[PDB]
Amino acid sequence: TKGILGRKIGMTQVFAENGDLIPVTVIEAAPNVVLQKKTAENDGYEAIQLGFDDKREKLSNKPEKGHVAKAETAPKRFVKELRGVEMDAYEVGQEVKVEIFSAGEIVDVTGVSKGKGFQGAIKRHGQSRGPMSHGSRYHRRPGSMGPVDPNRVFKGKLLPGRMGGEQITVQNLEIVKVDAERNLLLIKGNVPGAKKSLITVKSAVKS
Amino acid sequence: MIQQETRLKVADNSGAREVLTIKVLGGSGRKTANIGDVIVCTVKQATPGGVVKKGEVVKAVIVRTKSGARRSDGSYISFDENACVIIRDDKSPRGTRIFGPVARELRENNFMKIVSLAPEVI
Amino acid sequence: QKLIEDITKEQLRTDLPAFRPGDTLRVHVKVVEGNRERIQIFEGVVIKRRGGGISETFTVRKISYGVGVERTFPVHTPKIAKIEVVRYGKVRRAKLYYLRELRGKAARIKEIRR
Amino acid sequence: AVPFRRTSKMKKRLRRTHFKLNVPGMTECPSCGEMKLSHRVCKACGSYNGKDIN
Amino acid sequence: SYRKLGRTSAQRKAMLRDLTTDLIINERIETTETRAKELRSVVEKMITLGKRGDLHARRQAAAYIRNEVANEENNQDALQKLFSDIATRYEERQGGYTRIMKLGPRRGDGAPMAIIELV
RNA sequence: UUGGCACCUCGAUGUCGGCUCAUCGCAUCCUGGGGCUGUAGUCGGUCCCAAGGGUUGGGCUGUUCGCCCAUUAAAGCGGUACGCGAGCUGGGUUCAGAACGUCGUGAGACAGUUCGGUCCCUAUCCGUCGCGGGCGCAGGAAAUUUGAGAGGAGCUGUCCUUAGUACGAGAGGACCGGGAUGGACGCACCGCUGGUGUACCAGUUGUUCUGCCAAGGGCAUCGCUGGGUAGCUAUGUGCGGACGGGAUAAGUGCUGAAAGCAUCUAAGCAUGAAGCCCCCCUCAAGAUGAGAUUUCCCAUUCCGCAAGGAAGUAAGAUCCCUGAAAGAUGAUCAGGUUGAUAGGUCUGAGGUGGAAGUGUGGCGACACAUGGAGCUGACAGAUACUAAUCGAUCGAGGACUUAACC
Ligand SMILES: [Mg+2]
Ligand SMILES: [Mg+2]
Ligand SMILES: [Mg+2]
Ligand SMILES: [Mg+2]
Ligand SMILES: [Mg+2]
Ligand SMILES: [Mg+2]
Ligand SMILES: [Mg+2]
Ligand SMILES: [Mg+2]
Ligand SMILES: [Mg+2]
Ligand SMILES: [Mg+2]
Ligand SMILES: [Mg+2]
Ligand SMILES: [Mg+2]
Ligand SMILES: [Mg+2]
Ligand SMILES: [Mg+2]
Ligand SMILES: [Mg+2]
Ligand SMILES: [Mg+2]
Ligand SMILES: [Mg+2]
Ligand SMILES: [Mg+2]
Ligand SMILES: [Mg+2]
Ligand SMILES: [Mg+2]
Ligand SMILES: [Zn+2]
């Protein structure tokens, strides 16, 4: 497979030459750099680390600087791992650039959703409300709690709590256009995550 | 956004004037039906003549809706009244005339006869 | 923002005469029945011109056989041949929503050229 | 609802391990020599960030 | 966004207008922390209006500032003081006309107080 | 289910229907795989395996029941105090009022009918959903990870071809295999259509203030009406349940004796389902069995016979301060003067819709020009003008025993 890391920018439209409006997300990136090649004996598996979006030095400590020194580059900000991939197209210090995705491709997108804080049941799980009339005194509440016999509550009753803010994967999106100048990617549809956040793009696995 | 209990006014010389929606054909839930669909409906007001009598159960297609369809090229279209045309159990209409324009998502479907009988298609 | 700005503006269209809401104009749309490309002529009153950038749309409204019809487009679509302009009109709002009612009923509700 | 059983001393004392205060953030106004608190005006010296503030 | 200060919209606006005129008059007032933190972003806009200095901006400011007497022996009104004196003083400084200094907490309710003043 | 007994509860275990939320069994309603048929085909009938998922909107009655209308692939049967009232409702049910029918001489009565009729509780403990602090894991730290194990998801229609072919006098009309396109359900998101948008823009009534005109402020639900940025949103948009592998159930078998034959089996070898275990998505080393990899810091000073203890520090982190992609509070994330973290200023985006002043025309209300003007909360960029000052605290010196190599 193959994948890169990037940043979310925003959404807009483009016109296919057929003359069809298409919602488009704009994910930019910079040349990612391999940092470490996890072999099959030192580590019980096979993968590569990817760095991205270097930071100014005053924010980097000595351990991280030493870690990066093997690749001879500036200390990056995000460092992720990419597992299923051939391990001879890559050597530490190599650059990975956006041009590895032709148009009309099919890829997978992985991010982290945007938070919503403490949330009730009606919104967190999409339940129903009681009638708001006819003498009722019940609406926006999590319903009953179970039968009497167990003398307890089964593990699995859904209740209010902190909502959103976790990893999410969307599948089978199509690359629309690629710009090697601004280092951009244009994707049909829309991906999770708030603006100015990390975004992972990998080749489709369901294939 | 026609749904159960919505009232519509027919757009043909069948004899009925307005009609009431009973059920939306399709899957099991089918909360609603937009333009270019078929419903089952009962007549509420009819002209003294006409081939249809007041208080029956008939099938009809949807030709115009206030909320309107959305085409693939980003364009939209809308009307300002909900209309329908009675169906003779198959895409053939029952009346002979058609009043007011009809949408264009009918030709994409198999309603050739209607879209031919229309004064103008949009 | 500037990135979105230019990478979109590449596709912009630079032949449309300026026009404010509240003025009739003809539109030449390319409808295709799979074989040829008729050119439907649809003219009416500009009810609303909304949004900016490549997303800017507008709305035209007209009456035909008693019933009124609305129709919107994105201003930069290639589905449009050209846009004439029939008559300017003087108005005060920027959203002529009130026209949705005062159409028939002998209500001569029109505009006046500037 | 109602307390079904009284609470022992053990539980009462265990619950209160997190009910305490925090020593404030103190510093030294290097104009008078007393203990102001950070990012605030030394009400003793009446001075802050070198100069004075009437 | 912007704070609400636990008051109805109208009450909030009124309190803000009053604090503004009072600061223009005294040039150093003293109040709670968040209140001043909110107030500065209005005082600066008023000072900008004054720096522009024409009939239009003057009427705009008058539609916001109260009618108090700044220096009574001269019978100068707060608005005139603002325009003439302040505009003449902060003639060239590009924004950032105020400053905030934090005191300890109050006694009756432990609220943290602070001092706001013109630069 | 209708019953029988009277073992617990009368110093209180509150009924029937409906709402919200579900979960389990399988004697299966649909979808999956089969045997037989009085199965030509398309429909079927009956029996075997199978509980993964799915299983509706109204009319009439307080109603469960029941009948009816219209759809669907299907409109399953049961348990969980005839599930669930410290979660809701109170329609019927059984208090006090009144009336009718019948019985009683009478007060009254009826499991006859009808109208009206007070529903209390701030969550101590276990339990369920979320979020923190301490310590551990034989030195002290920063990152990236494997995955024992746990959860999620699992539905299905119509149409076109193969083909009017097989089959059938005819009527009618396929399996298998391809390809489009829906229903319901779920996840994410605000570019589009719309909603909201109480410190945005405009119009307008009454009254009262800024001495007066002109221009403005206050109050009247935000005074009312027309629009609307950012955020948050669905009815809006995008995508998903695909393709498969291994072992099986019912079934179908191959070879083959016991028993010269026969035989699916005893020894041997296969095939075989929406089930089972993987493939997909998420959590996950407090997995005390406390894992792995990469990088940084070093092995000070005092005491202490000794054992060990104490103090300054390294790498690093926190207190405090500016905040929001975060948020009930902690927490997380971006920054702290070699800096754009926030505010202001300048320039824009969008929103509203032609400011004031002056001039011209009109007797006047008003119109026109100066001029897409004026104004502008949250959005973009640049800009150190103001504020993140000075400081303080925490934080290693690496136990023994074996075997390798030395
Ligand atoms: Mg409901
Ligand atoms: Mg138990
Ligand atoms: Mg103590
Ligand atoms: Mg008010
Ligand atoms: Mg008791
Ligand atoms: Mg069974
Ligand atoms: Mg019950
Ligand atoms: Mg029982
Ligand atoms: Mg209960
Ligand atoms: Mg009585
Ligand atoms: Mg009588
Ligand atoms: Mg008698
Ligand atoms: Mg009653
Ligand atoms: Mg409660
Ligand atoms: Mg408690
Ligand atoms: Mg937007
Ligand atoms: Mg006046
Ligand atoms: Mg008053
Ligand atoms: Mg409004
Ligand atoms: Mg921001
Ligand atoms: Zn001091």
Side-chain angles (χ1 to χ4, degrees), chain B residues 36-110:
Chain B
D37 310 329
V38 52
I39 70 182
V40 62
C41 65
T42 173
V43 177
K44 281 301 181 178
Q45 289 172 10
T47 73
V51 71
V52 180
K53 316 305 296 168
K54 160 150 176 304
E56 313 187 57
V57 174
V58 289
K59 290 184 174 308
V61 77
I62 290 173
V63 290
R64 291 184 294 245
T65 63
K66 261 176 67 51
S67 169
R70 156 189 195 265
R71 320 204 164 190
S72 52
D73 54 355
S75 157
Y76 292 84
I77 176 169
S78 176
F79 298 78
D80 44 353
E81 54 86 16
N82 308 331
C84 71
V85 172
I86 313 193
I87 293 299
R88 194 190 47 75
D89 186 280
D90 193 305
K91 316 305 179 67
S92 88
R94 192 175 290 201
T96 44
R97 316 262 51 68
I98 288 292
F99 305 133
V102 305
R104 195 168 151 278
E105 279 66 12
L106 264 60
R107 194 169 66 253
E108 76 83 29
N109 204 317
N110 304 323

Side-chain angles (χ1 to χ4, degrees), chain A:
Chain A
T1 78
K2 45 175 189 174
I4 68 175
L5 310 185
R7 268 193 180 283
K8 188 176 184 181
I9 302 304
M11 305 195 48
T12 173
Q13 307 162 352
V14 311
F15 283 84
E17 81 295 349
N18 181 31
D20 312 333
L21 193 67
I22 287 175
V24 168
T25 308
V26 175
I27 292 170
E28 69 87 18
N32 301 326
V33 192
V34 295
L35 306 179
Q36 171 197 353
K37 192 181 312 187
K38 282 202 185 305
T39 185
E41 49 189 18
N42 295 70
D43 317 319
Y45 65 112
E46 301 282 56
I48 48 172
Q49 285 188 356
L50 288 198
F52 171 55
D53 192 9
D54 47 357
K55 58 164 87 163
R56 71 169 186 260
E57 66 85 17
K58 199 173 60 70
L59 313 187
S60 89
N61 48 48
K62 302 198 53 49
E64 191 266 5
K65 301 204 49 176
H67 170 33
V68 163
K70 273 174 281 203
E72 296 77 37
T73 173
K76 304 300 174 187
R77 184 179 306 274
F78 315 97
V79 171
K80 293 271 289 194
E81 205 154 335
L82 193 149
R83 197 173 177 187
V85 62
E86 205 284 331
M87 289 171 69
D88 287 318
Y90 309 102
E91 295 81 2
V92 285
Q94 186 179 324
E95 268 193 350
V96 161
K97 305 196 311 307
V98 59
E99 300 82 324
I100 77 183
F101 294 90
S102 84
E105 265 286 340
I106 287 178
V107 288
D108 279 310
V109 182
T110 284
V112 48
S113 158
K114 43 168 59 173
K116 319 266 191 176
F118 207 87
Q119 283 309 319
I122 290 291
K123 168 158 293 181
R124 195 178 168 193
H125 301 293
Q127 316 201 351
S128 316
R129 320 161 299 159
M132 296 186 65
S133 159
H134 294 325
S136 155
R137 283 158 57 183
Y138 191 83
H139 29 267
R140 317 200 61 104
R141 253 164 171 165
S144 157
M145 298 276 280
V148 178
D149 204 43
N151 291 321
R152 74 193 172 89
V153 162
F154 286 141
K155 271 188 181 165
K157 174 57 178 180
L158 301 187
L159 282 192
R162 178 157 310 183
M163 162 183 178
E166 75 281 24
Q167 196 176 341
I168 277 293
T169 290
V170 178
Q171 301 182 97
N172 307 154
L173 296 195
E174 166 163 44
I175 287 298
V176 164
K177 203 184 78 60
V178 191
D179 168 29
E181 311 317 296
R182 270 69 61 99
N183 300 320
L184 301 188
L185 271 193
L186 300 187
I187 309 185
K188 187 157 83 67
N190 43 9
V191 312
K195 305 185 194 174
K196 204 187 315 167
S197 60
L198 190 85
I199 280 289
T200 318
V201 172
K202 320 171 60 165
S203 65
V205 63
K206 276 192 186 178
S207 290

